[PDB]
Amino acid sequence: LARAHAGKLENIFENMGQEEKKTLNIVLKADVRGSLEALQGSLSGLGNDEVQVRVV
Amino acid sequence: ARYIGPKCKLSRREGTDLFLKSGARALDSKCKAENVPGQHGQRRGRLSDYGLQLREKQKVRRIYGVLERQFRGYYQEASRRKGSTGENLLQLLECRLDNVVYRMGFGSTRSESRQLVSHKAITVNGQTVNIPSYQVKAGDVVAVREKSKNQLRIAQALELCGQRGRVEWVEVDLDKKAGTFKSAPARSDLSADINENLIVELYSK
Amino acid sequence: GYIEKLVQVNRVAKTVKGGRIFAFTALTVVGDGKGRVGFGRGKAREVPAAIQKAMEAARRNMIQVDLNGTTLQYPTKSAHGASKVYMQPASEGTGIIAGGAMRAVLEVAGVQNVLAKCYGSTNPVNVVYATFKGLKNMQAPEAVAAKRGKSVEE
Amino acid sequence: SMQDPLADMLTRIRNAQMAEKTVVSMPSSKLKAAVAKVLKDEGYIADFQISSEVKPQLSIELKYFEGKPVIEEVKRISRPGLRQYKSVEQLPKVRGGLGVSIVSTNKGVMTDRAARAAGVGGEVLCTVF
Amino acid sequence: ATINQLVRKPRKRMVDKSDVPALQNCPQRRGVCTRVYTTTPKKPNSALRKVCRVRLTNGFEVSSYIGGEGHNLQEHSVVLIRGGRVKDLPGVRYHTVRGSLDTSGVKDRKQGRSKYGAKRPK
Amino acid sequence: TVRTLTGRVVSDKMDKTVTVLIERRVKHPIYGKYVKRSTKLHAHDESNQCRIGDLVTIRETRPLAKTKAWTLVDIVERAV
Amino acid sequence: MVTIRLARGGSKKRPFYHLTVTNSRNARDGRFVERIGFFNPVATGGEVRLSVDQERATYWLGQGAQPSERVAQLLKDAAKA
RNA sequence: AGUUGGUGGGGUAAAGGCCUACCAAGGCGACGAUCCGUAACUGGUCUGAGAGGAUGAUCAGUCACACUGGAACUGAGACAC
RNA sequence: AGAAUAAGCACCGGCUAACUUCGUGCCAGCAGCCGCGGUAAUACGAAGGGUGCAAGCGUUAAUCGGAAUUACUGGGCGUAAAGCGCGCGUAGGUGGUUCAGCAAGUUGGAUGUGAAAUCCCCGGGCUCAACCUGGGAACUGCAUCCAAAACUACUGAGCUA
Ligand SMILES: [Mg+2]
Ligand SMILES: [Mg+2]
Ligand SMILES: [Mg+2]
Ligand SMILES: [Mg+2]
Ligand SMILES: [Mg+2]
Ligand SMILES: [Mg+2]
Ligand SMILES: [Mg+2]
Ligand SMILES: [Mg+2]
Ligand SMILES: [Mg+2]
Ligand SMILES: [Mg+2]
Ligand SMILES: [Mg+2]
Ligand SMILES: [Mg+2]
Ligand SMILES: [Mg+2]
Ligand SMILES: [Mg+2]
Ligand SMILES: [Mg+2]
Ligand SMILES: [Mg+2]
Ligand SMILES: [Mg+2]
Ligand SMILES: [Mg+2]
Ligand SMILES: [Mg+2]
Ligand SMILES: [Mg+2]
Ligand SMILES: [Mg+2]
Ligand SMILES: [Mg+2]
Ligand SMILES: [Mg+2]
Ligand SMILES: [Mg+2]
Ligand SMILES: [Mg+2]
Ligand SMILES: [Mg+2]
Ligand SMILES: [Mg+2]
Ligand SMILES: [Mg+2]
Ligand SMILES: [Mg+2]
Ligand SMILES: [Mg+2]
Ligand SMILES: [Mg+2]
Ligand SMILES: [Mg+2]
Ligand SMILES: [Mg+2]
Ligand SMILES: [Mg+2]
Ligand SMILES: [Mg+2]
Ligand SMILES: [Mg+2]
Ligand SMILES: [Mg+2]
Ligand SMILES: [Mg+2]
Structure with missing residues (x-):
C-alpha cells in the first residue's frame, strides 16, 4: 500500500507537470514468477513521450 | 475476567459503604467518600428511573464481585426457581x-x-x-x-x-x-437497603 | 397520604403581538400507598409553582380503591378518549410490569403486582384518566354480594 | 330481521336498565325462560312472569340496589355467526368468578360454576357481571 | 371485517423490501472502483463529500461513501463495501470499509479507530 | 366391525358404479367458524339399483378399478 | 437378522450405552425397534452400572434375536445377580 | 379420448387401464381443475405473555439423486454410490 | 521457583448510564432518528476524566418483538385512508314460534396411537458450570366404541307476531 501511494503521488505530480498520457492497459498472466517479473520489467521501456503501457 | 483496579471508586460512585477494603481503619478517612470519582465530582446530578435501576444492579454486582454474563445466568436460574425471584437472586x-x-x-x-x-x-x-x-x-x-x-x-x-x-x-x-x-440466609438476614425490585424491574424490560 | 410522583412536566406556548408567552404544565399523582390515590394538574410561568399547584390539586379529590392485598381483584379493561388500558392481578414475586404514567399511578395507589399494558394513544394524562377509571370501578367481594349472601357467589 | 332473539332479550334488559325502568316486556320462548330463570336464581333480576294465549310474553322485574343498575355488564358470546363451544376446563371465568357465564349443557341451561361442579362442558351463551 | 369475509379471504401480510438490494443477504461484498469524485450534500448542509462508484461481483453498479478524513482510493482499486446509507447524500446506500483490501485505514486516528481500520499506536 | 360412510347419489351415468357425495362439517383452523366440505367417491353398484338423489351407505374394500375402491351395502333413503 | 447391541451415547471419553434391539443392517445410532436397558462403563456414586428388562430381553431372545458378544456377557452377568 | 366405466383375455409376488380387443360417453373444476413461478418433507429450531410469525444447519425418521439421457441382466432384495 | 507470563473494545446532546478544556470555523468532518459544524462546538479531531462490557468489544447482513401497523384473541370507514351512483337477483351465509323423533355438530368417559432425541419437573455423575444421563410430565392431534339430549343441523306434524 505504501509503495502504491508513493508511486501515485510521484506519477500525479509528473503528469500534472506535463499534461496527460494515453495508456495501454494489459492484464498479464504467466506460468512462473521469473517470467512474470521479466515481462513486467521488459514492458516498461516500450512507451513514448505521449503514449505509455501499463500492467493493471 | 475479574475487576482488578481501584476498589474504592466503586464505593464513591455507588454512594454506599459497599465493603471492599478490610474495614480495619475506616472508609471515610481514606477517600473522602462523598463525591463521585473524577474531575466532575462536586456535581450532584439527579438521575432517572433507568439510572436508579442500573445503579442498584451495579451495586449488587460490585458487592459480590461477579460479571454481567454470570449475573444474567443467576437471574435466569432465580426466575426459573419457585417463590419470588427477588430474594431468590440473593439466596443464590x-x-x-x-x-x-x-x-x-x-x-x-x-x-x-x-x-x-x-x-x-x-x-x-x-x-x-x-x-x-x-x-x-x-x-x-x-x-x-x-x-x-x-x-x-x-x-x-x-x-x-x-x-x-x-x-x-x-x-x-x-x-x-x-x-x-x-x-x-433468608431475606431478613441481610441488610434491608438493597431494593431487588429495581433489579427485577431492570431485567424485565 | 404523602407519596409524590412527578408524572410529567411540559412547556406550552401562546402567541400575542410581540411574540410568545411560555408556560409550564405539570401532572402529578399523590397517595398513601394503602388505598387512596389522586392526580393533579398545575400550570404556571415557573416550574416550581406549576408543580406546587399540581400537588395541591392532587391532594384534593382523592378516591378510595379496593384492592386484594397489594394485588388487583380481577383483570380490568378501561378506556378514556383514544387511550385503552388492560390490567390483571399477578403473583407475589412479580413487580410492576407497566409503562410510564401507569407505573406511577399503580405504585402510588399501593398495588405491587399488576402486570399491566396500554393500547391506543399513550398520552400520559389520558392514560392517567383511564387508569383511575379502571381502578375506581373496582368492586371486590362483599360488595358484589348486594344480590344475595356471601361465600355462595364465589 | 330478528336473526337472533336472545341477543334481543339481552339488549332489551340492557337498554331498560340504562333508562331507569322497572319492568321489561318481550315475546317469550323456552330458552329465554331458562335464561331468565338462571338470572333470577343468581339474583340479577327480581322476578319473571309468562302470560297465556298462544302469544305468551315474558315480563322481567329489574333490581337497582343503589343508584346504579344491578346488571353492570351483559354481553352475548355465541352469536348465530360464531357458535362457540367450550369444554369443562376452558369455561371462562368472568371478573375472576364474581360474575357468571351462562352455559347450555346437555343437562340444561345453567351457570359456569354448576357446569364445573358437574364436570360437564357445553355451549357458552352469554356473560353477565 | 366479518368472520365470513375473513374466511373467504384471509388477512394478507405485506413484505418489507430490503434497503440494500446489492449484496444480496451478504454482510459485505467486494468490487472494483470505477470513479472517484466529490459531491455536494442536500440543502441544509454544506460540504464536499467523498464518494466512489463501485462495480460489484453481482454485476451491480452502486455508489459508496468513503469515511474518515483522508483516503487513497483511485480508479481500478478493489474495495469492500457494506450496508448503511448516508442520509445527507441522495442515492448513496453503502459504505466503504477502511483497511480491508486496498483502503489502508485512516492515519493518525486515536479514538474509536476500529471503525476506520487503524492499528494500536503502542 | 366395519366403518361406513353415508351420503347422497350425484351421478349414475356410468355402468355398474355410482358417484356419491359425502358432506362433512369442519371447524376453520384460525377463524373458528364451521364450514362445510364435500367429498366425491366412486362406489360399486353391482346391479345398478341406485338413482340420482338417493341417500345410501358405502364401505371400503380393495380397489376394483382405478379411482374406485368403495362398495355400497344398502340404500336407506330412496329418491322420489 | 434382528440383533441386540450397544448404541453409544454420552460424550468424548465418557461413553454411555443403550441396549437396543435393531435390524442388523442399520446405523449404530440409527433407527431401532426397542430399547431394553443401558450400560454405564464409569458409573460411580449413585449411578448404576447396567440395567436390563428381564421380560423384554427374554421375549426378544425367544423370538430369534442374536445378541452381540458384549450384550451376551452383560446379560448373563445381569442374570447372575 | 386409455381419457372415465363394463366385459373377454394377457401380465404381476400381489388389487388395479397395468396392458390389449370390443361396448358405452363418461371423468375432473370457483370447496380453484389446468397452467405459471417457487420449493425435498417431518420431529424440530428462533422469537412471542399467549394466539401467532419466521424457518427445516448440526441430531433422528422418510424421500430422490450418483458426469448427462435411456435399458435391462444377476440376485431374497437394484433398474444398482 | 518467583509477582513472576498474561487487557482490550465501544461510548459520554436527547432517546440512553457517563463532561470539561484545547484545535478548526457551513471547512475538515459526524450521523440509527431528531439533527451538529458560519470564532467561546458537552454532537467534528485530540487530551484529561468518566460510563458500559470484558478475552473479547463494535459494525454490517438477516428473523421475530415492540407494531393493537392485516386487529381470531385484538382495528377501522360523516370530516384523517376507507359505503359500490342506485335497484333486482344466482351460488353462498343466516333463520319467527310449538310438540315428537334421530344423534352430524356439541359434551363426558374408555381403548389404541401420537418414534427416540429436543422443551419442562424431580434426581444422579464429571472439583463447579457447560455437558452427559434415570424416571416422570407433555405431545394441545387422530381413530374406534359407550353414554347425554339444552343448543345448531336433519326428519314429521302444527301456530300466526
Ligand atoms: Mg467468558
Ligand atoms: Mg398510534
Ligand atoms: Mg443501518
Ligand atoms: Mg375390475
Ligand atoms: Mg384400447
Ligand atoms: Mg381380467
Ligand atoms: Mg421384482
Ligand atoms: Mg394405480
Ligand atoms: Mg379389462
Ligand atoms: Mg389454481
Ligand atoms: Mg430446488
Ligand atoms: Mg404481541
Ligand atoms: Mg417447507
Ligand atoms: Mg451437511
Ligand atoms: Mg436425516
Ligand atoms: Mg445414468
Ligand atoms: Mg430375477
Ligand atoms: Mg436405486
Ligand atoms: Mg455397488
Ligand atoms: Mg444522561
Ligand atoms: Mg473552541
Ligand atoms: Mg451526539
Ligand atoms: Mg467528540
Ligand atoms: Mg437489524
Ligand atoms: Mg402482530
Ligand atoms: Mg421492525
Ligand atoms: Mg376483529
Ligand atoms: Mg386504525
Ligand atoms: Mg375523505
Ligand atoms: Mg379531503
Ligand atoms: Mg350511497
Ligand atoms: Mg338463496
Ligand atoms: Mg330459531
Ligand atoms: Mg338454510
Ligand atoms: Mg418423544
Ligand atoms: Mg454435582
Ligand atoms: Mg406420560
Ligand atoms: Mg336419546
Missing part, C-alpha cells in the same frame, strides 16, 4: 464458595477469599474445591487444608471478623478453622 448469590469463605472469617474481603479458594487452600466435603462459584449446599463443612492452616492471612481475617456482626447462619470452629453451613 449468598451461597457462592468465596462469599461463604468470607462470611466464615477466613478472608478479610471477597478478593482475598477468592485468592484463597482459587489457590487450592479450601476443602468443602473433605475434598479440594477451587471454583469460586461452587454453590455450597446446606450442611457442608468448609475447612482449611492442613498445609495452609498456618498462613497469617487467616489469623488476621479471623481476629478482624471477630467484630463485624454475628452472621448467625455459619458456625466457625476457631481453634482449627473449620466451618459449617446450616442453611441459606
Whole structure:
C-alpha cells in the first residue's frame, strides 16, 4: 500500500507537470514468477513521450 | 475476567459503604467518600428511573464481585426457581464458595477469599474445591487444608471478623478453622437497603 | 397520604403581538400507598409553582380503591378518549410490569403486582384518566354480594 | 330481521336498565325462560312472569340496589355467526368468578360454576357481571 | 371485517423490501472502483463529500461513501463495501470499509479507530 | 366391525358404479367458524339399483378399478 | 437378522450405552425397534452400572434375536445377580 | 379420448387401464381443475405473555439423486454410490 | 521457583448510564432518528476524566418483538385512508314460534396411537458450570366404541307476531 501511494503521488505530480498520457492497459498472466517479473520489467521501456503501457 | 483496579471508586460512585477494603481503619478517612470519582465530582446530578435501576444492579454486582454474563445466568436460574425471584437472586448469590469463605472469617474481603479458594487452600466435603462459584449446599463443612492452616492471612481475617456482626447462619470452629453451613440466609438476614425490585424491574424490560 | 410522583412536566406556548408567552404544565399523582390515590394538574410561568399547584390539586379529590392485598381483584379493561388500558392481578414475586404514567399511578395507589399494558394513544394524562377509571370501578367481594349472601357467589 | 332473539332479550334488559325502568316486556320462548330463570336464581333480576294465549310474553322485574343498575355488564358470546363451544376446563371465568357465564349443557341451561361442579362442558351463551 | 369475509379471504401480510438490494443477504461484498469524485450534500448542509462508484461481483453498479478524513482510493482499486446509507447524500446506500483490501485505514486516528481500520499506536 | 360412510347419489351415468357425495362439517383452523366440505367417491353398484338423489351407505374394500375402491351395502333413503 | 447391541451415547471419553434391539443392517445410532436397558462403563456414586428388562430381553431372545458378544456377557452377568 | 366405466383375455409376488380387443360417453373444476413461478418433507429450531410469525444447519425418521439421457441382466432384495 | 507470563473494545446532546478544556470555523468532518459544524462546538479531531462490557468489544447482513401497523384473541370507514351512483337477483351465509323423533355438530368417559432425541419437573455423575444421563410430565392431534339430549343441523306434524 505504501509503495502504491508513493508511486501515485510521484506519477500525479509528473503528469500534472506535463499534461496527460494515453495508456495501454494489459492484464498479464504467466506460468512462473521469473517470467512474470521479466515481462513486467521488459514492458516498461516500450512507451513514448505521449503514449505509455501499463500492467493493471 | 475479574475487576482488578481501584476498589474504592466503586464505593464513591455507588454512594454506599459497599465493603471492599478490610474495614480495619475506616472508609471515610481514606477517600473522602462523598463525591463521585473524577474531575466532575462536586456535581450532584439527579438521575432517572433507568439510572436508579442500573445503579442498584451495579451495586449488587460490585458487592459480590461477579460479571454481567454470570449475573444474567443467576437471574435466569432465580426466575426459573419457585417463590419470588427477588430474594431468590440473593439466596443464590449468598451461597457462592468465596462469599461463604468470607462470611466464615477466613478472608478479610471477597478478593482475598477468592485468592484463597482459587489457590487450592479450601476443602468443602473433605475434598479440594477451587471454583469460586461452587454453590455450597446446606450442611457442608468448609475447612482449611492442613498445609495452609498456618498462613497469617487467616489469623488476621479471623481476629478482624471477630467484630463485624454475628452472621448467625455459619458456625466457625476457631481453634482449627473449620466451618459449617446450616442453611441459606433468608431475606431478613441481610441488610434491608438493597431494593431487588429495581433489579427485577431492570431485567424485565 | 404523602407519596409524590412527578408524572410529567411540559412547556406550552401562546402567541400575542410581540411574540410568545411560555408556560409550564405539570401532572402529578399523590397517595398513601394503602388505598387512596389522586392526580393533579398545575400550570404556571415557573416550574416550581406549576408543580406546587399540581400537588395541591392532587391532594384534593382523592378516591378510595379496593384492592386484594397489594394485588388487583380481577383483570380490568378501561378506556378514556383514544387511550385503552388492560390490567390483571399477578403473583407475589412479580413487580410492576407497566409503562410510564401507569407505573406511577399503580405504585402510588399501593398495588405491587399488576402486570399491566396500554393500547391506543399513550398520552400520559389520558392514560392517567383511564387508569383511575379502571381502578375506581373496582368492586371486590362483599360488595358484589348486594344480590344475595356471601361465600355462595364465589 | 330478528336473526337472533336472545341477543334481543339481552339488549332489551340492557337498554331498560340504562333508562331507569322497572319492568321489561318481550315475546317469550323456552330458552329465554331458562335464561331468565338462571338470572333470577343468581339474583340479577327480581322476578319473571309468562302470560297465556298462544302469544305468551315474558315480563322481567329489574333490581337497582343503589343508584346504579344491578346488571353492570351483559354481553352475548355465541352469536348465530360464531357458535362457540367450550369444554369443562376452558369455561371462562368472568371478573375472576364474581360474575357468571351462562352455559347450555346437555343437562340444561345453567351457570359456569354448576357446569364445573358437574364436570360437564357445553355451549357458552352469554356473560353477565 | 366479518368472520365470513375473513374466511373467504384471509388477512394478507405485506413484505418489507430490503434497503440494500446489492449484496444480496451478504454482510459485505467486494468490487472494483470505477470513479472517484466529490459531491455536494442536500440543502441544509454544506460540504464536499467523498464518494466512489463501485462495480460489484453481482454485476451491480452502486455508489459508496468513503469515511474518515483522508483516503487513497483511485480508479481500478478493489474495495469492500457494506450496508448503511448516508442520509445527507441522495442515492448513496453503502459504505466503504477502511483497511480491508486496498483502503489502508485512516492515519493518525486515536479514538474509536476500529471503525476506520487503524492499528494500536503502542 | 366395519366403518361406513353415508351420503347422497350425484351421478349414475356410468355402468355398474355410482358417484356419491359425502358432506362433512369442519371447524376453520384460525377463524373458528364451521364450514362445510364435500367429498366425491366412486362406489360399486353391482346391479345398478341406485338413482340420482338417493341417500345410501358405502364401505371400503380393495380397489376394483382405478379411482374406485368403495362398495355400497344398502340404500336407506330412496329418491322420489 | 434382528440383533441386540450397544448404541453409544454420552460424550468424548465418557461413553454411555443403550441396549437396543435393531435390524442388523442399520446405523449404530440409527433407527431401532426397542430399547431394553443401558450400560454405564464409569458409573460411580449413585449411578448404576447396567440395567436390563428381564421380560423384554427374554421375549426378544425367544423370538430369534442374536445378541452381540458384549450384550451376551452383560446379560448373563445381569442374570447372575 | 386409455381419457372415465363394463366385459373377454394377457401380465404381476400381489388389487388395479397395468396392458390389449370390443361396448358405452363418461371423468375432473370457483370447496380453484389446468397452467405459471417457487420449493425435498417431518420431529424440530428462533422469537412471542399467549394466539401467532419466521424457518427445516448440526441430531433422528422418510424421500430422490450418483458426469448427462435411456435399458435391462444377476440376485431374497437394484433398474444398482 | 518467583509477582513472576498474561487487557482490550465501544461510548459520554436527547432517546440512553457517563463532561470539561484545547484545535478548526457551513471547512475538515459526524450521523440509527431528531439533527451538529458560519470564532467561546458537552454532537467534528485530540487530551484529561468518566460510563458500559470484558478475552473479547463494535459494525454490517438477516428473523421475530415492540407494531393493537392485516386487529381470531385484538382495528377501522360523516370530516384523517376507507359505503359500490342506485335497484333486482344466482351460488353462498343466516333463520319467527310449538310438540315428537334421530344423534352430524356439541359434551363426558374408555381403548389404541401420537418414534427416540429436543422443551419442562424431580434426581444422579464429571472439583463447579457447560455437558452427559434415570424416571416422570407433555405431545394441545387422530381413530374406534359407550353414554347425554339444552343448543345448531336433519326428519314429521302444527301456530300466526
Ligand atoms: Mg467468558
Ligand atoms: Mg398510534
Ligand atoms: Mg443501518
Ligand atoms: Mg375390475
Ligand atoms: Mg384400447
Ligand atoms: Mg381380467
Ligand atoms: Mg421384482
Ligand atoms: Mg394405480
Ligand atoms: Mg379389462
Ligand atoms: Mg389454481
Ligand atoms: Mg430446488
Ligand atoms: Mg404481541
Ligand atoms: Mg417447507
Ligand atoms: Mg451437511
Ligand atoms: Mg436425516
Ligand atoms: Mg445414468
Ligand atoms: Mg430375477
Ligand atoms: Mg436405486
Ligand atoms: Mg455397488
Ligand atoms: Mg444522561
Ligand atoms: Mg473552541
Ligand atoms: Mg451526539
Ligand atoms: Mg467528540
Ligand atoms: Mg437489524
Ligand atoms: Mg402482530
Ligand atoms: Mg421492525
Ligand atoms: Mg376483529
Ligand atoms: Mg386504525
Ligand atoms: Mg375523505
Ligand atoms: Mg379531503
Ligand atoms: Mg350511497
Ligand atoms: Mg338463496
Ligand atoms: Mg330459531
Ligand atoms: Mg338454510
Ligand atoms: Mg418423544
Ligand atoms: Mg454435582
Ligand atoms: Mg406420560
Ligand atoms: Mg336419546
